[PDB]
């Protein structure tokens, strides 16, 4: 459908906002990132493609923390994701200043959804070219959400985005089938690494670095922390072992 | 601080003191406290140190801008109405203009002199003879006694001599004489032998 | 403070003292109370030292911009009105200023414009400002003439400040003489009031009430 | 005035007198100083009547807006909203507030917000002009986890003395009992508490 | 100190039998000094008369304001403003500046062109509609006028008898007020004509 | 992010016509018919209420609305524009006139304020004209009963009787034959119903038809007693029962 | 000024005196102090006469517009909220002390609003200089379940106490009775206990007593 | 422009050979009324900083909120927020000193006197003062409010100059602080018997001691005082 | 939003303002308005374009407006746009009286409106006013004056001018019969004769005519003719 896709706020005769649909095409080109909701927290994993050996390992972090209990991972236009996360940090700080409590994840997800959606209202602005998997632990459990360029978001047992989303979603579905009682935080980290490695088979042309993050009540006391050192290497070893 | 004005049959005579005093001493004794708003309109002013000249020169620019714009000289009534409005606007502004003015002019269309007294509040009143501040305390008794509408310019000047002499005699301050200007059908001129 | 500027056949003579006091404590003895706005315009400090120095330094830039645009030297009347208008904008905000904008121009001749913090702007032949102004007037009003020679005019300005320095507690230090001519102002040196008083006393016989 | 709030085993009780005075004159002798800012969050108002009423109206608007968006607030959140208004306008609003509320997780909570705009969580709080006369009595007699009957008897004794000694305090004693069973309003007339 | 007492002046309005009367003194002064004996304080905007007392600068400002407002009213409405409508126009205009108020007390007087009944109304400096069926007073000598008008006034005075009553109330009240006098002007307003009269009075 | 339509979307075409005004007037032509008739002792404004669905409670959607107690309006065209435009008209009736002069505006001045609102949309940047034509009927003590039509362009004219909307051409032809300078209000209602009966295609009863009149003051609708100078609204909606009673005698 | 409101078994009655004073002088002997906010919501104001008239006129405008917007009879609570929020916004500079009473679909209401924006609910209220004198009568005689007649008598009697005992109150008694089921009845000058007596002499001047300088005819 | 309503009394501190010690009482006074007794006026900011605040409690709770925002905003996009990029005492102080001066220049001061005590990453002791006017200074011993007149004379006997810091041990510094707290309780009317004490050591880290108690007070000499002069019995 | 902008305020490749030319074309389809300046007054006449037997001619004042006690204007083009300018003209006339305490000169009032029209023609991106005015007024300086202004913001003084439809025919007829020394009563005839010839209808009748005059108590009066008055003169003039 041409003619109606040159502007951001225009409905096509079918009611479809094409520019937002084109923004989704930007997301589908990004590196695959997933989020797994465990029985007491959430786990985030992102594939970081190694463009060249000259990138210093472990410095180009792509998972972001908001306040202290929300972690955000996104795929698509990385600058757009940072713009969205910068707003979330402002929204989270504003909520804490006025209400004194850390912003609830369902409340935070709405704050971001209103912002992302507001970018589809006017033709003087462009839609976000990122789908953001975000979540954390709040007063009433763990929450995992996923935004879209249109501003739509839902709660997920496990979310996947980026180029390997179709591959990753297959293994996320297997996790919920095999573990309906709830997956443990430590096992979720190992499974998160395995899913990213499997999803990378859609990007075999280039090497990648796995980055994991997670926020569990029992293990981080409800705060968002990165996987590093021994725990990261066990996940990498497990992911390679299953691949081999 | 002396500002006097007397309207006679054919002209308006405005007299204003020459002294300028700043605190302890007299800086100048030849100051002209008047501005020619139009070829036939003259404005005498008195008040606070800086407000008098800033206001007078600001008014003169607008009257000059009107004259050039319409190629027409505002009547003294219109000029006084314009001047009163600015004083009325300022009296209730951030920094009011504490300026008292006399506007003497010759209306070339009615062929009659006109004298208007406006104080810093914006109280415009047309008088046969006017004065601002305490200068009217000493002079009104003489003007009420001797003034007649049909005086000639020479009789009007003779009457100002009496008014100025009384101010010299009884007023404590030394105002260093007066500069006298006459607004007539021929324009504005200054009397030098006064 | 004591600053004077008077007009005469040879131009303008600007004489100022150099004492700055913080109460009765004499903070400085060698304050420069004349701002050299341009090679052709001279300022003068009285009252607010910072207000005079800052705005007359700023005024020099405005005069320079007029030079660049109009390609002609700004008149003293315009220079004093630029300062007078600005000083009026801040009226009531706390500015303190009494200054003479001395300059000599072809179309206008020697010109002194007295500008103060009230927004006043007066053209005159003789002006004195500061605490000791009444003493400077006394000497000037009696000995001032239009036909003064440059040598006699310089002495009269030097003598007028000496009289104010002697009698005024807040005036003294030294006398700074400036002479404004057709080709700019000329600095005629700094004369110490302490040394000048004894020199003047012997040559004139004046100050007979002072032993020495 | 004389306002009071006491946590007890089953929840929290807010209490206050009913007198408001403009000088010596009692403008209204049956005033209701207990204000509902949310279903189970109530506040006691002391100080300027105009300021406290304005703040209570704004806080109720904020907590109503909070509930529609972020679920039911806690008593800590209600006190936080009070603090922002009382603190960000401390030079204008001369308001001292006692906020008490009930939620299942934390049971009864009491927050006092003195004239400065600070927030203090307390087991019991007393404010108003008449409170100064019962600082010693309340401290000696307050106990943790008293029953509803003991707390009401404790509050009746406390306010009867605050009413007795303060000219600007008196009238009927109005109580609001916040518990899991709901909100209960009690009123005690001078003939009931005056001869305790 | 008090702006309403700097310039002096007084205005009084009375109602009669199908006629209204509004009168004022002609003095303008600067406290003790009398400046002008021709400063009229009664203005008309058609068949509705407005007498404004108080600060002379505000009296002049409001005259040009209500001339501006009533002139635009007649262009949009294509009819003259009635006394009742004008009374609310004055009231709102004075309240629009509650915190920058004009130090003036106006007095509206007129006859409704349609109903034909006399109308007079009074005001404070911030626009309280003091609609009275008998008489209205304003100015420095309001105390004198109240007692003077309250005793002389009687209902349903003919236009000739109303002139004697209002003029006598004004002259005797002005005579006992330092800042009022130097002549007075009386308007006798009838449904068909208006008569303007200048009174002989003490010039001290 | 900012509003970037600071330019006018209504502009003159090479033929001199303003495209958006003409299209706004077209939307009125496909609008539901409404008419007004000015009688010697009142004005009647009528329209039919076509319901979106039989499950809709048409009583909740009044096509005839009160602007001031003595002024009422009906529309033809886009319903939403009339609703917001009526809200503006009621507001400006207070802010611009009543709060100054103490009394409600006359019909001519209120129509002018409404026309100014429509004209502003016809020249201001980033807006389209209102797609409604209003028939504003009112009364005032000096001009009496009056009926005005206001167009999307902001132009307004006074009418003895008029009809706007889908059946305007047929209605106006009918009104010309029937209208005369001797009509009473009871006769105008009869003529209004007859004219409206022609336009309506479906059911013609009190529920599918909406009438309002400006007539004698209704002190029973005033809501209070004790102020003789207050005499009550002149604008009155005829309830479905009242209309049905007149239909039986139609 | 003396103003009282008295809630009775089926409505509320507000009464006020009619004297307006400029210091010690009685500017208006028959000022109407009861103002409409809507047909069945009425307000009585003490303190500054202009602000009470102006504040109610502004709120009355907004009540009418809001009533037209919502297509509902105004709530007395809406008037109270917009009235108190307006007064609070001006931090007490609008010196309007008001008793707002009325009937709405939710019953009869009686509030008092102070110049600073504080409000209180009550079954009987009083404002003005005569409030203490009027409240003495209300305290003595008020009782639950007053009938319309008892309330009107009590309200008028309370106003009379202020009239007789307060210098700032006098002349006549204005009464407005708002009952839930029917219209509000404004009893202007309900009682007129201060009718002036006949003067001892007639002061009709003989025509020609006044000296005139000039006479003119003014064009209209 | 404001005035204090509920206030905290003096905070005292001093640096010793290996770190710093800071103490403050747990009282909020409302005039002469010792109203609130649970106020904690020492605010740990990370593992190497403690911020002691005195004066208005309402502004103290505002500053306490700003500090918790620093720790949050520092960890944003900062993988080294725990080591090599954590907040130092010097960074925290400059933020507070800037805030306190900015509020002063707006004539809306934070009516507080703050002592930031901590140990830098390189081990150097940090101890700086800042008040509502934005005035800042450093010393081996710092005290706020009433403690500047009574605690500083006592602490300065232990560390009178910079060269005395390496000669002062934890025990000597701690007993000096504890004795100063007792002296303040003796002669300060707005002081409490309970206080908190924080020790920041470059080796053992932060040691925060809550609910410390003023002990070993001397009153037995009061029985021998009779009347105000002439009285004998 | 840049794609939807019509670029109102731009020049054509041959130095013409497109929207102003189109606005003028719009005015050429409006009812004719004629102004004739006589020795003792000014005559403003206009032809109503919208007409019907159900239209209220008695109070349908849509082309002749009063700006002042001394000035009036006849309007051709968008009636809605005119009333916006009419009210600003009225306010300006009163602002001048408030400031200078004198009636505004006609040229000053005309210049202000023409400046308002020109503003929309040069900046702001909004469409021009589609109205042409004929100002008829009096002042002490120039006496009776007759001006016309168009959407472009240009205004000129005239002795007799017509705007709206059939200006070419109306102007040619005025050229043939206008005598400088003619009285108002002759201007009454000339205005009606010219309209009766350029009118697009079969005949000219009182219902189609707006008519006003300005004439000299020695004070200038404004008379906007009521329908019966217009019907009277039409018989007297012989139309």
Swiss-Prot record, chain C:
Q: Which UniProt keywords apply?
A: Cytoplasm, Hydrolase, Nucleus, Protease, Proteasome, Threonine protease, Zymogen
Keyword Protease listed: yes
UniProt subcellular location: Cytoplasm; Nucleus
- List where the protein spans the membrane: none
**Which GO MF term does the entry hold, naming one?**
threonine-type endopeptidase activity
This protein's superkingdom? Eukaryota
GO cellular-component term (any): proteasome core complex, beta-subunit complex
Question: What EC number(s) are associated with this protein in UniProt?
Answer: 3.4.25.1
Provide the function of this protein: The proteasome degrades poly-ubiquitinated proteins in the cytoplasm and in the nucleus. It is essential for the regulated turnover of proteins and for the removal of misfolded proteins. The proteasome is a multicatalytic proteinase complex that is characterized by its ability to cleave peptides with Arg, Phe, Tyr, Leu, and Glu adjacent to the leaving group at neutral or slightly basic pH. It has an ATP-dependent proteolytic activity. This unit is responsible of the chymotrypsin-like activity of the proteasome and is one of the principal target of the proteasome inhibitor bortezomib.
Q: What else is known?
A: The side chain of Thr-1 acts as a nucleophile, and the N-terminal amino group acts as a proton acceptor.
Instruction: Tell me the protein family, please.
Output: Belongs to the peptidase T1B family.
Descriptive protein name: Proteasome subunit beta type-5
Q: Which organism is it from?
A: Saccharomyces cerevisiae (strain ATCC 204508 / S288c)
Q: Which gene encodes it?
A: PRE2
**Part of the intact protein present:** 76 to 287 of 287
Swiss-Prot record, chain D:
Q: Which residues form a coiled coil?
A: none
Quaternary organization: The 26S proteasome consists of a 20S proteasome core and two 19S regulatory subunits. The 20S proteasome core is composed of 28 subunits that are arranged in four stacked rings, resulting in a barrel-shaped structure. The two end rings are each formed by seven alpha subunits, and the two central rings are each formed by seven beta subunits. The catalytic chamber with the active sites is on the inside of the barrel.
* Entry's EC annotation: 3.4.25.1
The protein's matches in Pfam families, at most eight in alphabetical order, are given as:
Proteasome
What keywords were assigned to this record? Answer: Acetylation, Cytoplasm, Hydrolase, Nucleus, Protease, Proteasome, Threonine protease, Zymogen
**Protein location:** Cytoplasm; Nucleus
Please identify the protein, giving its name as recorded: Proteasome subunit beta type-1
Q: Does the keyword Kinase apply?
A: no
Top EC class of this enzyme: hydrolase
Gene name of the record: PRE3
Reaction catalysis annotation: Cleavage of peptide bonds with very broad specificity
Q: Which CDD domains match?
A: proteasome_beta_type_6 (cd03762)
Principal place where this protein is found? cytoplasm
GO biological process, any = proteasome-mediated ubiquitin-dependent protein catabolic process
Task: Give the active-site positions.
Answer: 1
Q: What else is known?
A: The side chain of Thr-1 acts as a nucleophile, and the N-terminal amino group acts as a proton acceptor.
Family of the protein in this entry:
Belongs to the peptidase T1B family.
Q: Which GO terms describe its cellular component?
A: cytosol; nucleus; proteasome complex; proteasome core complex, beta-subunit complex; proteasome storage granule
One MF annotation (Gene Ontology) recorded for this entry: endopeptidase activity
Swiss-Prot record, chain G:
Q: What cellular component terms from Gene Ontology apply here?
A: cytosol; nucleus; proteasome complex; proteasome core complex, beta-subunit complex; proteasome storage granule
Top-level taxon of origin: Eukaryota
- Report the record's Gene Ontology biological process terms: proteasomal ubiquitin-independent protein catabolic process; proteasome-mediated ubiquitin-dependent protein catabolic process
Reply yes or no: does the keyword Ribonucleoprotein apply.
Answer: no
Annotated compartments: Cytoplasm; Nucleus
Catalytic site residues? 1 (nucleophile)
One example GO MF annotation: threonine-type endopeptidase activity
The UniProt record lists the EC number as: 3.4.25.1
Name the chemical reaction catalysed here.
Cleavage of peptide bonds with very broad specificity
Keyword ATP-binding applies? no
Keyword entries, A-Z: Cytoplasm, Hydrolase, Nucleus, Protease, Proteasome, Threonine protease, Zymogen
Further information: The side chain of Thr-1 acts as a nucleophile, and the N-terminal amino group acts as a proton acceptor. Present with 11400 molecules/cell in log phase SD medium.
Q: Name the job this protein performs.
A: The proteasome degrades poly-ubiquitinated proteins in the cytoplasm and in the nucleus. It is essential for the regulated turnover of proteins and for the removal of misfolded proteins. The proteasome is a multicatalytic proteinase complex that is characterized by its ability to cleave peptides with Arg, Phe, Tyr, Leu, and Glu adjacent to the leaving group at neutral or slightly basic pH. It has an ATP-dependent proteolytic activity.
* Family as reported in the entry's similarity comment: Belongs to the peptidase T1B family.
Q: What is the protein's name according to its record?
A: Proteasome subunit beta type-2
From Swiss-Prot, chain I:
User: What is the predominant subcellular site recorded for this chain?
Assistant: cytoplasm
Q: Where is this cross-link: Glycyl lysine isopeptide (Lys-Gly) (interchain with G-Cter in ubiquitin)?
A: 98, 197, 226
A single Gene Ontology CC term: cytosol
**Where would you find the membrane-spanning parts of this chain?**
none
Q: Name one GO biological process term.
A: proteasomal ubiquitin-independent protein catabolic process
Q: Which UniProt keywords apply?
A: Cytoplasm, Isopeptide bond, Nucleus, Proteasome, Ubl conjugation
The superkingdom of the source organism is Eukaryota
Annotated compartments: Cytoplasm; Nucleus
The chain's disulfide connectivity reads none
Q: What else is known?
A: Present with 17100 molecules/cell in log phase SD medium.
Please state which protein family the record places this protein in: Belongs to the peptidase T1A family.
Q: How does it assemble?
A: The 26S proteasome consists of a 20S proteasome core and two 19S regulatory subunits. The 20S proteasome core is composed of 28 subunits that are arranged in four stacked rings, resulting in a barrel-shaped structure. The two end rings are each formed by seven alpha subunits, and the two central rings are each formed by seven beta subunits. The catalytic chamber with the active sites is on the inside of the barrel.
**Role description:** The proteasome degrades poly-ubiquitinated proteins in the cytoplasm and in the nucleus. It is essential for the regulated turnover of proteins and for the removal of misfolded proteins. The proteasome is a multicatalytic proteinase complex that is characterized by its ability to cleave peptides with Arg, Phe, Tyr, Leu, and Glu adjacent to the leaving group at neutral or slightly basic pH. It has an ATP-dependent proteolytic activity.
PANTHER family in UniProt: PROTEASOME SUBUNIT ALPHA/BETA
Name the chain's protein: Proteasome subunit alpha type-3
* Gene label: PRE9
């Amino acid at each position: 459908g041409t003619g109606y896709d040159l502007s951001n706020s225009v409905f096509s005769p079918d009611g479809r906002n094409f520019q937002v649909e084109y923004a989704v095409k930007a997301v589908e080109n990004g590196t695959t990132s997933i989020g797994i909701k465990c029985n007491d927290g959430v786990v985030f994993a992102v594939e970081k493609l190694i463009t060249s050996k000259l990138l210093v390992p472990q410095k180009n972090v792509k998972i972001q923390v908001v306040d202290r209990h929300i972690g955000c991972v996104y795929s698509g236009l990385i600058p757009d994701g940072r713009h969205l996360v910068n707003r979330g940090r402002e929204e989270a700080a504003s909520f804490k200043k006025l209400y004194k409590t850390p912003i609830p994840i369902p409340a935070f997800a709405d704050r971001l959804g209103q912002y992302v959606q507001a970018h589809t209202l006017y033709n003087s602005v462009r839609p976000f070219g990122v789908s953001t998997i975000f979540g954390g632990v709040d007063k009433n459990g763990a929450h995992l959400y996923m935004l879209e360029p249109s501003g739509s978001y839902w709660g997920y047992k496990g979310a996947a985005t980026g180029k390997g989303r179709q591959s990753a979603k297959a293994e996320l579905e297997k996790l919920v089938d095999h573990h309906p009682e709830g997956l443990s935080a430590r096992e979720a980290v190992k499974q998160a690494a395995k899913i990213i490695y499997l999803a990378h088979e859609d990007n075999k042309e280039k090497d990648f670095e796995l980055e994991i993050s997670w926020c569990s009540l029992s293990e981080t006391n409800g705060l968002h922390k990165f996987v590093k050192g021994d725990l990261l290497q066990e996940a990498i070893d497990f992911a390679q072992k299953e691949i081999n | 601080d002396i500002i006097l004005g007397i309207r006679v049959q054919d002209s308006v005579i405005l007299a204003s003191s020459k002294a300028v005093t700043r605190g302890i001493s007299v800086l100048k004794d030849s100051d002209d406290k008047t501005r020619q708003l139009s070829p036939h309109t003259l404005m005498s002013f008195a008040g606070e140190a800086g407000d008098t000249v800033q206001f007078a020169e600001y008014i003169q620019a607008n009257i000059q801008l009107y004259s050039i714009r319409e190629d027409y000289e505002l009547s003294p009534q219109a000029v006084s109405s314009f001047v009163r409005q600015e004083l009325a606007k300022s009296i209730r502004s951030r920094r009011p203009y504490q300026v008292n003015v006399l506007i003497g002019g010759y209306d070339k269309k009615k062929n009659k002199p006109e004298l208007y007294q406006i104080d810093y509040l914006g109280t415009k009143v047309e008088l046969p003879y006017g004065a601002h501040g305490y200068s009217g305390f000493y002079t009104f008794s003489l003007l009420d006694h001797h003034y007649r509408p049909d005086m000639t310019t020479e009789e009007g000047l003779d009457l100002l001599k009496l008014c100025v002499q009384e101010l010299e005699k009884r007023m404590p301050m030394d105002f260093k004489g007066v500069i006298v200007k006459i607004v007539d059908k021929d324009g504005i001129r200054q009397v030098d032998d006064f | 403070t004591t600053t004077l500027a008077f007009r005469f056949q040879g131009g303008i003579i600007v004489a100022v003292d150099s004492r700055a006091t913080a109460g009765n404590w004499v903070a400085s003895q060698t304050v420069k109370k004349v701002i050299e706005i341009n090679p052709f315009l001279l300022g003068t400090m009285a009252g607010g030292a910072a207000d005079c120095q800052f705005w007359e330094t700023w005024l020099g830039s405005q005069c320079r911009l007029h030079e660049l645009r109009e390609k002609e030297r700004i008149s003293v009347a315009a220079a004093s009105k630029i300062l007078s208008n600005l000083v009026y904008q801040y009226k009531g905000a706390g500015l303190s200023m009494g200054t003479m904008i001395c300059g000599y121009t072809r179309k206008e001749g020697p010109t002194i414009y007295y500008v103060d913090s009230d927004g006043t702007r007066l053209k005159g032949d003789i002006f004195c400002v500061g605490s000791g102004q009444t003493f400077a007037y006394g000497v000037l009003d009696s000995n001032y003439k239009w036909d003064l020679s440059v040598e006699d005019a310089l002495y009269l300005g030097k003598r007028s400040i000496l009289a104010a320095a002697h009698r005024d507690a807040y005036s003294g230090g030294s006398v700074n003489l400036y002479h404004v001519t057709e080709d700019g102002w000329i600095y005629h040196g700094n004369h110490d009031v302490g040394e000048l008083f004894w020199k003047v006393k012997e040559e004139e016989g004046s100050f007979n009430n002072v032993i020495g | 005035t004389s306002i009071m709030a006491v946590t007890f085993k089953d929840g929290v009780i807010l209490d206050a007198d009913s007198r408001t005075t403009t000088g010596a004159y009692i403008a209204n002798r049956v005033t209701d100083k207990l204000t509902r800012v949310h279903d189970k969050i109530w506040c006691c108002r002391s100080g300027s009547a105009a300021d406290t009423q304005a703040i209570a109206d704004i806080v109720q608007y904020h907590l109503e807006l909070y509930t529609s968006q972020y679920g039911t607030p806690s008593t800590e959140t209600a006190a936080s909203v009070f603090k922002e208004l009382c603190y960000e306008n401390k030079d204008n609003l001369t308001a001292g507030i006692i906020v008490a509320g009930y939620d299942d997780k934390n049971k009864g909570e009491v927050y006092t917000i003195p004239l400065g705009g600070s927030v203090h969580k307390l087991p019991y709080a007393i404010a108003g002009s008449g409170s100064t006369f019962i600082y010693g009595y309340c401290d000696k007699n307050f106990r943790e986890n008293m029953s509803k009957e003991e707390t009401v008897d404790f509050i009746k004794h406390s306010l009867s003395q605050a009413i007795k000694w303060d000219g600007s305090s008196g009238g009927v004693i109005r109580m609001v009992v916040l518990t899991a069973a709901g909100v209960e309003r009690l009123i005690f007339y001078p003939d009931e508490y005056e001869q305790l | 100190s008090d702006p309403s007492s700097i310039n002096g002046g007084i205005v009084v309005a009375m109602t009669g039998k199908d006629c209204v009367a509004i009168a004022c003194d002609l003095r303008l002064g600067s406290q003790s000094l009398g400046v002008s004996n021709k400063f009229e304080k009664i203005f008309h905007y058609g068949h509705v008369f407005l007498g404004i007392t108080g600060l002379a600068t505000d009296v002049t400002t409001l005259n040009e304001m209500f001339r501006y407002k009533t002139n635009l009213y007649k262009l949009k409405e294509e009819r003259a403003i009635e006394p009742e409508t004008f009374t609310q126009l004055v009231s709102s205009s004075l309240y629009e500046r509650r915190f920058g108020p004009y130090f003036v007390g106006p007095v509206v007087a007129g006859i409704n062109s349609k109903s034909g009944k006399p109308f007079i109304a009074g005001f404070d400096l911030i626009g309280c509609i003091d609609e009275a069926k008998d008489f209205i007073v304003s100015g420095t000598a309001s105390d004198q006028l109240f007692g003077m008008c309250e005793s002389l006034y009687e209902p349903n005075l003919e236009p000739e008898d109303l002139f004697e009553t209002i003029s006598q109330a004004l002259l005797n009240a002005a005579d006992r007020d330092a800042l009022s006098g130097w002549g007075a002007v009386v308007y006798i307003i009838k449904k068909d004509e208006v008569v303007k009269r200048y009174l002989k009075m003490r010039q001290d | 992010m900012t509003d970037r339509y600071s330019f006018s979307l209504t502009t003159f075409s090479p033929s001199g016509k303003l495209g958006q005004i003409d299209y706004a007037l077209t939307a009125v032509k496909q609008g539901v018919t409404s008419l007004g008739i000015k009688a010697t002792n009142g004005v009647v404004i009528a329209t039919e209420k076509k319901s979106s669905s039989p499950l809709a409670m048409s009583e909740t959607l009044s096509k005839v609305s009160l602007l001031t107690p003595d002024i009422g309006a009906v529309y033809s065209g886009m319903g939403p524009d009339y609703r917001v435009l009526v809200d503006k008209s009621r507001k400006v009736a207070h802010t611009s006139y009543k709060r100054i002069y103490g009394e409600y505006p006359p019909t001519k001045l209120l129509v002018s304020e409404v026309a100014k609102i429509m004209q502003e949309a016809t020249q201001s940047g980033g807006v389209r004209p209102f797609g409604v034509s209003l028939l504003i009927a009112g009364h005032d003590e000096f001009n009496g009963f009056s009926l005005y039509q206001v167009d999307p362009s902001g132009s307004y004219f006074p009418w003895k009787a008029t009809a706007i909307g889908k059946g305007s051409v047929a209605a106006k032809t009918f009104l010309e034959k029937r209208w005369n300078d001797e009509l009473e209000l009871e006769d105008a209602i009869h003529i209004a119903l007859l004219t409206l009966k022609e336009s309506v295609e479906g059911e013609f009863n009190g529920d599918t038809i909406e009438l309002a009149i400006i007539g004698d003051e209704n002190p029973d609708l005033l809501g209070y007693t004790g102020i003789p100078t207050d005499k009550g609204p002149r604008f009155r909606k005829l309830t479905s029962q009242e209309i049905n009673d007149r239909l039986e005698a139609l | 000024t003396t103003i009282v409101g008295v809630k009775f078994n089926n409505g509320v009655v507000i009464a006020a005196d009619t004297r307006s004073t400029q210091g010690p002088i009685v500017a208006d002997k028959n000022c109407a102090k009861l103002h409409r906010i809507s047909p069945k919501i009425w307000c009585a104001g003490a303190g500054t006469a202009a602000d009470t008239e102006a504040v109610t006129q502004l709120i009355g405008s907004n009540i009418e517009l809001h009533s037209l917007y919502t297509s509902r009879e105004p709530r007395v609570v809406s008037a109270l909220q917009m009235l108190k929020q307006h007064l609070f916004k001006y931090q007490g500079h609008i010196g309007a002390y008001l008793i707002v009473a009325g009937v709405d679909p939710t019953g009869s209401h009686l509030f008092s609003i102070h110049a600073h924006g504080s409000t209180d609910v009550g079954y009987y209220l009083s404002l003005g200089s005569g409030s203490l004198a009027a409240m003495a009568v209300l305290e003595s005689h008020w009782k639950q379940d007053l009938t319309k007649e008892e309330a009107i008598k009590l309200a008028s009697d309370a106003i009379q106490a202020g009239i007789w005992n307060d210098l700032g109150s006098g002349s006549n008694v204005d009464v407005c009775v708002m009952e839930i089921g029917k219209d509000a009845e404004y009893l202007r000058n309900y009682l007129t206990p201060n009718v002036r007596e006949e003067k001892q002499k007639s002061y009709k001047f003989p025509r020609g007593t006044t000296a005139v300088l000039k006479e003119s005819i003014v064009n209209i | 422009t404001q005035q204090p309503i509920v206030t905290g009394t003096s905070v005292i501190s001093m640096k010793y050979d290996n770190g710093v010690i800071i103490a403050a009482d747990n009282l909020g006074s409302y005039g002469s009324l010792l109203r609130f007794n649970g106020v904690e006026r020492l605010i740990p900011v990370g593992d190497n900083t403690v911020v002691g605040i005195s004066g208005d409690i309402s502004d103290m709770q505002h500053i306490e909120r700003l500090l918790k925002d620093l720790v949050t905003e520092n960890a944003y996009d900062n993988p080294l927020a725990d080591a090599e990029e954590a907040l130092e005492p010097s960074y925290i102080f400059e933020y507070l000193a800037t805030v306190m001066y900015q509020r002063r220049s707006k004539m809306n001061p934070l009516w507080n006197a703050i002592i930031v005590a901590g140990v830098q990453s390189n081990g150097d002791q940090f101890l700086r003062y800042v008040n509502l006017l934005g005035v800042t200074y450093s010393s081996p011993t710092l005290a706020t409010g009433f403690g500047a007149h009574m605690a500083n004379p006592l602490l300065r006997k232990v560390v009178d100059r910079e060269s005395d810091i390496p000669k002062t041990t934890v025990q000597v510094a701690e007993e000096a602080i504890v004795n100063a707290m007792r002296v303040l309780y003796y002669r300060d009317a707005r002081s409490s018997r309970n206080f908190s004490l924080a020790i920041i050591d470059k080796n053992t880290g932060l040691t925060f001691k809550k609910n410390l108690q003023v002990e070993n007070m001397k009153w037995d000499f009061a029985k021998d005082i009779k009347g105000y002069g002439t009285q004998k019995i | 939003s840049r794609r939807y902008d019509s670029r109102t305020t731009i020049f054509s490749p041959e130095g013409r303002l497109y929207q102003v030319e189109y606005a003028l074309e719009s005015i050429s389809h409006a009812g004719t308005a004629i102004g004739i300046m006589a020795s003792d007054g000014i005559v403003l006449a206009a032809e109503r374009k919208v007409t019907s037997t159900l239209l209220e001619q008695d109070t349908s004042t849509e082309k002749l407006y009063k700006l002042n006690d001394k000035i009036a204007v006849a309007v051709a083009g968008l009636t809605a746009d005119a009333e916006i300018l009419i009210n600003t003209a009225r306010i300006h006339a009163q602002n001048y009286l408030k400031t200078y305490n004198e009636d505004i000169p006609v040229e000053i009032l005309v210049r202000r409106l023409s400046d308002i029209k020109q503003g929309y023609t040069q900046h702001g991106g909004l469409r021009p006013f589609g109205v042409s005015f004929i100002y008829a007024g009096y002042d002490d300086r120039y006496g009776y004056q007759l001006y016309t202004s168009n959407p472009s913001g240009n205004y000129t003084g005239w002795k007799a001018i017509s705007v709206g439809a059939n200006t070419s025919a109306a102007q040619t007829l005025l050229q043939m019969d206008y005598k400088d020394d003619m009285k108002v009563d002759d201007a009454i005839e000339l205005a009606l004769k010219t309209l009766s010839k350029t009118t697009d209808s079969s005949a000219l009748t009182y219902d189609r005519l707006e008519f006003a005059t300005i004439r000299k108590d020695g004070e200038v009066y404004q008379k906007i003719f009521k329908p019966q008055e217009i019907k009277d003169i039409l018989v007297k003039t012989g139309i």
